[model samples]
Target: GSSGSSGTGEKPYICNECGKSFIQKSHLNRHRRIHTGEKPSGPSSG
Candidate 1:
């Protein structure tokens, strides 16, 4: 486990939903599910 809440804008991604700052935008992107939904597998997405 890691808890390094440093006081700085080093957080690459910030989630207001959970009020947590992550160091990766990908993490925030994937983690934004309740807000992202899904569309899996296809160039012809329906």
Candidate 2:
């Protein structure tokens, strides 16, 4: 039988771009943002 990281770690949160998962829901979003190249932005830096 073949198990997976999800099966082993029991992490419910999964990533779209990445294959890894996280236990913390917040961290999952943060990690996903990294893959999507997201960062803090402002209305006008200039």
Candidate 3:
């Protein structure tokens, strides 16, 4: 349980970097980009 300002509400997915908890895993992964400095994958069809 890393402390980084997490929400007191019930969240299934929590970010270890910022401790931002999200209800969905996808949302959590997307939020992780903030700390990882990683961008989302481009569209499969160009």
Query: In order, what lDDT does every prediction score?
Result: 0.69, 0.72, 0.74
Leading candidate by TM-score: 2
Q: In candidate 3, what are the lDDT values of residues 1-46, reduced to their tens digit?
A: 9577675576788888766777888898888886566457844353
**Top-lDDT candidate index:** 3
Clashes of each: 0, 0, 0
Which has the better TM-score: candidate 2, or candidate 3? 2
User: Residues 1-46, candidate 2, lDDT per residue (tens digit)?
Assistant: 6664545556688887758877889998877876456458745333
- For model 3, the superposed segments whose C-alpha errors exceed 4 Å read 1-9, 38-46
Clash pairs, model 2 backbone: none
State the RMSD for candidate 3. 9.6
TM-score, one value per model: 0.46, 0.54, 0.53
The TM-score between candidate 3 and the true structure equals 0.53
Per-residue lDDT of candidate 1, residues 1-46 (tens digit): 4467666566768888667777778888778774546677546433
Q: lDDT score, residue 33, model 1?
A: 70
